[PDB]
Amino acid sequence: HHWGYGKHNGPEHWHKDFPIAKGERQSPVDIDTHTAKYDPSLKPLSVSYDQATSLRILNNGHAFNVEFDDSQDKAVLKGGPLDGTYRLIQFHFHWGSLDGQGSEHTVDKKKYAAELHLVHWNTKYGDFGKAVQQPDGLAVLGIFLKVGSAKPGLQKVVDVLDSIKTKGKSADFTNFDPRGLLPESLDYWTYPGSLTTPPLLECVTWIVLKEPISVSSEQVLKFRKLNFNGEGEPEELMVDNWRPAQPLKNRQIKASFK
Template sequence: MVVMSILRAILQASPCRSPWRRFQIPSSVPARPCSLYTCTYKTRNRALHPLWESVDLVPAGERQSPINIRWRDSVYDPGLKPLTISYDPTTCLHVWNNGYSFLVEFEDSTDKSVIEGGPLEHNYRLKQFHFHWGAIDAWGSEHTVDSKCYPAELHLVHWNAVKFENFEDAALEENGLAVIGVFLKLGKHHKELQKLVDTLPSIKHKDTLVEFGSFDPSCLMPACPDYWTYSGSLTTPPLSESVTWIIKKQPVEVDHDQSQKVQSRPEEGETKETAAGTRSIERFRQKLHEAWLLREQKAQEEFRIKKEKEEAARKRQEEQEVWYSSDNQLTS
């Protein structure tokens, strides 16, 4: 209880007195704790970030994230249904630069943009989405698959508005958040992502934002509905074990130019390398505890099996009809 009280105090502290000040949006919009909850392990001068220095605030739980996803360890759960995603483009508000990264925030006072189904018991409202990347394309994603790292990872952050009154409370409690993770890999040009990339020059400086209305983030997700899911945590302080992770199996392709522009979001005067080093999350991947299974949903495979069975049944029906027709001709 003491730890939770301390965490709440941090989240609710005013910008001028809190280390969360770096994650506050400009005064042109209502001040509130940043919904990104990302801070780097080290600051620009390579010193430990204040929140990482406070060891007492780091939970010693067994559901810490991120993890290395191993195919052989994932357990197929036939009870897992496809995730239902319903985003209203008009709820998209703005893109802003918090000095470490950029994120896109959404209006979340109603259930206009929600996800449901899959491993979730309730509807979860979309709060924001952001990216994690590295200084080079060889690494950057927080999660890995069989130790393979992707250039970047997209996180769409949702909160449980059925059980909690606000995002800040949900972020601290079990089943409070649901985060969809999407891997990005180098490939063909992504037309929809380009709309976001085009806004980035307008938020070059820390604490700047630009309106970004009528955008449906489902366009950033892969066509394949299959995913892995596990119960985990925030990947940065306060590291609360409040997250149901839903990691899409199929990565999304972006071209090299788009990848470079997403990575190069430093403030003026910084080099790409130094800024990227502070923006990427420097936390070792955690071990998935045996008590918390990594489950997988294979809707695409189930669909394929269903189609194969239907096709086999159709062929049997045709063969029976041919046999019946031939038999009638012989008897006549």
């Protein structure tokens, strides 16, 4: 067996193999907008994706990852709440079986249809595997998806999904520009948290954008045609691959905006 999002191995079971699941800085969380405090000391986010080099897309059995060449300082996240330079390694999404659920973070208990995670590692730790062992090792930029108008910059991702239907399939995926997945505004909330999948390491500075992007119903329907299973195994649609909100405990969520 293995962890997953099924009836028998979903989020409420993860603690049995990953006891940090019940830890002090777990993610995602509900963002209570009225209690989040505006912090005028927070800087604008600096997103520098002009030279980003995508390489490949992978169905890993839990989601799909669009992977980047992180061997040089290209595609970096700086500023905001962060000290230093964080390099983009991959992005992926979490989504629902229906448009009314799918996000990991919630906003005043509102669930979005999906949530995009742009994952970055702190260059002071040299590579990703070392960074996840540090409390300031990662910065994950989270972006909500709502269903409405299509996101033109998402379509190249949607169209390659047919070629990675099942667990363990990958496809070449070069020249994809992740700037096409951003909203207009970079206003954000931030808090200290964790990976949202096992091993659930408490190594993430979360930066969650206030403004969702709009994707079309047809775009998200194509996410829901993916499979958790491998080729030749009983079909299990890749849907509801989100962890619910976890206790905030002794944390403060800060807002970059009034």
